[PDB]
Protein: NS3/4A
Amino acid sequence: HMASMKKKGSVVIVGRINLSGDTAYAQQTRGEEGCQETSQTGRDKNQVEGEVQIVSTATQTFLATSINGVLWTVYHGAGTRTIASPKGPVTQMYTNVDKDLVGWQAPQGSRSLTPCTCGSSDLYLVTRHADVIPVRRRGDSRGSLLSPRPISYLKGSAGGPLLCPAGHAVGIFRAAVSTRGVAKAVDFIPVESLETTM
Ligand SMILES: CC(C)(C)OC(=O)N[C@H]1CCCCC/C=C\[C@@H]2C[C@@]2(C(=O)NS(=O)(=O)C2CC2)NC(=O)[C@@H]2C[C@@H](OC(=O)n3cc4cccc(F)c4c3)CN2C1=O
Ligand SMILES: [Zn+2]
Structure:
């Protein structure tokens, strides 16, 4: 009944993949209880840093990547949710279920990647565990893993970036191409598709 109808919480930034130095590593910035509270209020006072955030809802955790002043992630993780911010919940600026893509204005303190113009096919996927996995581009939205991985290894990394050698954004990881639980390739939203959305 109407009086007891609930609202979904906000997406909450709970960590980042630190790419600032010579070593990529995951950092947690909020534990489970704080995450739950922040999802409910939508008020996140934490300082945000970096290009790749680790984000959570009540039920899932995944990644989000800042490119050209927008924090992007997958619809299959975020749905239509707001994101928590210092001033309360922030509404999506982009939503496209057909691309599996959503975006919010990039948090103050975040750094954005630049869309790649290199037209190069040697790529690098960054996972939620801060693994940097070489990927050979095989089409507009596909790349092959030079070393195949169990899908367990990739789960929770949707929303993270594929980067070129010079560190530009080439795409956003969307889905694993897998057989018998082994991923040989990845499917990604190309950055040009983001640029068109913008
Ligand atoms: C498309 C194809 C070739 C048939 O393959 C697959 O459908 N494969 C599966 C394999 C699943 C096994 C785990 C794989 C491990 C990691 C996967 C990266 C990941 C993830 O980590 N999510 S998450 O845990 O962070 C989660 C919290 C955010 N995404 C998924 O699971 C996605 C989600 C779902 O797909 C979609 O809803 N759409 C909507 C699309 C719209 C347009 C185009 C698309 F392609 C779209 C794909 C199935 N998914 C796969 O990957
Ligand atoms: Zn580039």
User: Anything to note?
Assistant: The domain at 1-113 is CATH 2.40.10.120 (Thrombin, subunit H). Residues 11 and 57 are 5 Å apart (CA to CA). The chain has two domains: 1-113, 114-198.
